[PDB]
């Protein structure tokens, strides 16, 4: 209810438009300390030998590597996903080729997903890229996952209170997933699980056009509310405000009225929809029943899953050069 001064302010718009970031230094420092737990890159190994899909029996994604580099990748993955459990989280103790454990199959699809992100979505992740740690932060279950219904607490490792899991908490579950606003919508299920809905709702002409402006030919105003809820969610998930990407003088305008971060955010929306539709949701049959949602759906990812309240995940920390096997993949 009180944050002591000073604040940190950036300027993202023309002078006098009060556009830019506003940050609490203690919050920034706490997030920086949290994100600095990123394990250092493992020492490089000599890339010499015959390819691993000659020595090994069940390699389907990382076949091009050699035994030292492949083992280094496995060591990085166990640091990033299951440091407490170790190799046994995904592997049979005796048969390293066995794919009996569901985390093995999930992790294979996750390797493909990470390579896809680092190869085909450089329009969003640029040369920073992602690794398993970007979402997992050293846990089997990433701290911020999404279902078709909002949940509390946001970090799923924390056990929910009675109200957070009860029907009477529904409104709060909405509010705390849209930065405490009263907007009566779940923008993740509407906009980020798939690409069925149009986020944009603002007209692009001064006067109402014939054919779209009366009665049943109009989109309901609920769409405006829903997009506002999505934008609140994005601002909270990225740890910024609307002027990071907009000149609120005209939210609908581009050019001098939007920042480059808005174009990157559009690429992020496309990438999140793609990841949910093509990699995370189709994993439903592999999971046990305790990982699925109320509708029996598989857990998904949103902006918060990678960003976790920072405009750049881990403040732009990168491992792309250190682990080329995670992307970009040269065809």
């Amino acid at each position: 209810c009180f944050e002591p001064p000073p604040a940190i302010s950036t300027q993202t718009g023309f002078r006098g438009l009060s556009m830019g970031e506003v940050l609490h230094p203690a919050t920034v420092a706490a997030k920086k300390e949290r994100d600095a737990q990123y394990p250092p890159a493992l020492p490089a190994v000599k890339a010499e030998g015959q390819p691993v899909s000659k020595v090994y029996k069940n390699v389907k994604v990382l076949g091009d590597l050699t035994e030292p580099e492949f083992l280094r990748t496995m060591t990085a993955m166990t640091e990033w996903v299951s440091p407490k459990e170790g190799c046994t989280y995904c592997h049979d103790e005796a048969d390293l080729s066995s794919e009996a454990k569901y985390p093995f199959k999930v992790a294979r699809r996750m390797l493909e997903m990470t390579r896809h992100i680092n190869t085909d979505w450089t329009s969003h992740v640029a040369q920073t890229g992602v690794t398993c740690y970007t979402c997992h932060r050293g846990r089997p279950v990433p701290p911020y996952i999404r279902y078709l219904e909002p949940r509390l607490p946001l970090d799923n490792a924390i056990k929910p209170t009675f109200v957070e899991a009860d029907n009477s908490g529904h409104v709060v579950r909405l509010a705390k997933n849209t930065a405490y606003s009263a907007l009566n919508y779940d923008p993740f299920a509407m906009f980020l699980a798939n690409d069925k809905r149009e986020i944009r709702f603002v007209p692009q002409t001064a006067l109402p056009p014939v054919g779209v402006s009366r009665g049943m030919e109009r989109r309901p105003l609920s769409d405006a509310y829903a997009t506002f809820a999505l934008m609140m969610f994005i601002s909270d998930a990225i740890g910024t405000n609307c002027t990071f990407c907009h000149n609120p003088q005209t939210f609908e305008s581009w050019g001098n009225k939007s920042t480059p971060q808005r174009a990157i955010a559009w690429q992020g929306i496309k990438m999140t929809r793609d990841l949910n539709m093509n990699f995370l949701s189709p994993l439903k049959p592999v999971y046990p029943a305790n990982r699925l949602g109320a509708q029996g759906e598989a857990p998904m990812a949103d902006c918060r899953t990678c960003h976790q309240g920072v405009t750049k995940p881990l403040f732009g920390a990168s491992r792309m050069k250190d682990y080329p096997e995670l992307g970009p993949v040269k065809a």
Partner: protein, 273 residues
């Protein structure tokens, strides 16, 4: 040039500074030392606005915008076309407002009136100072202040509001808006009641203060009274800015998050989760 009852009131004395030097009228206007300074600042500031507008991109009256400096300049004087003109006009505006208030003090001293009007005028001056000086000082530069333009200062208000993701949830804003609406409604009621009593209809008699009390005791069960309604109107009008200033000064210096999250103090009480 005089109201028919005016001459007996035009006596010397009551000035704060200047004495008989500027103690005179020009037409209906009282001048005084602070009338002289008000005209100085008004002429200078409007002329600087005119020249600075002439050098901007559009001369359409509603598109003119004189903006403060970039944040990088901090509190330093900026080049005139890049915020320096805004700084000069800001100084002229402050001088004009304070001169006007002090001339009101002199006029009310001359008339044997209470100083309620210049004191009330102090409130919007204080809000202007909060917006353009005090909050910029806390935030660390003149670049946080609003620009001068019919529609551009609205852009500043808009973007300032959305820097905190929904300004409607600002508690100081909620109080300020409640006072604004209450004041407009109370002014409507008060004007209507006085006019209804003085203008009953066709050939009907002017009614009395007892009729004023009776009307509102009938309608809502309470009548605040003739003097008390003026006290209340002043109270509500003043509290618009007096309580808004808290939300304004808090936004950034005391609160960097979205305003809806501030209500977590209530929502997140552990007793009810």
């Amino acid at each position: 040039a005089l109201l028919s009852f005016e001459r007996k009131y035009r006596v010397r004395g009551g000035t704060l500074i200047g004495g008989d030097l500027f103690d005179f009228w020009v037409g209906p206007f009282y001048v005084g030392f602070f009338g002289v300074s008000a005209i100085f600042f008004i002429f200078l500031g409007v002329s600087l606005i005119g020249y600075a507008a002439s050098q901007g991109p559009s001369l359409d009256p509603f598109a003119i915008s004189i903006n403060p400096p970039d944040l990088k300049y901090g509190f330093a004087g900026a080049p005139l076309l890049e915020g320096g003109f805004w700084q000069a006009i800001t100084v002229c505006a402050i001088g004009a407002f304070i001169s006007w208030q002090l001339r009101e003090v002199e006029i009310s001293r001359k008339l044997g009136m209470g100083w309620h009007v210049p004191i009330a005028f102090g409130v919007p001056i204080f809000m202007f100072l909060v917006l353009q000086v005090f909050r910029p000082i806390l935030m660390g530069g003149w670049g946080f202040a609003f620009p001068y333009g019919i529609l551009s200062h609205l852009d500043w208000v808009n973007n300032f509001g959305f820097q905190y993701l929904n300004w409607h949830y600002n508690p100081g804003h909620m109080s300020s808006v409640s006072f604004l609406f209450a004041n407009a409604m109370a002014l409507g009621l008060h004007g209507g009641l006085i006019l209804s009593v003085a203008n009953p209809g066709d050939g009907d008699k002017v009614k009395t203060a007892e009729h004023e009390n009776a009307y509102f005791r009938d309608v809502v069960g309470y009548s605040i009274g003739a003097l008390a309604i003026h006290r209340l109107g002043l109270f509500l009008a003043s509290n618009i800015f007096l309580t808004g200033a808290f939300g304004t000064i808090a936004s950034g210096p005391f609160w960097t998050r979205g305003w809806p999250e501030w209500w977590g103090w209530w929502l997140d009480i552990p007793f009810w989760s």
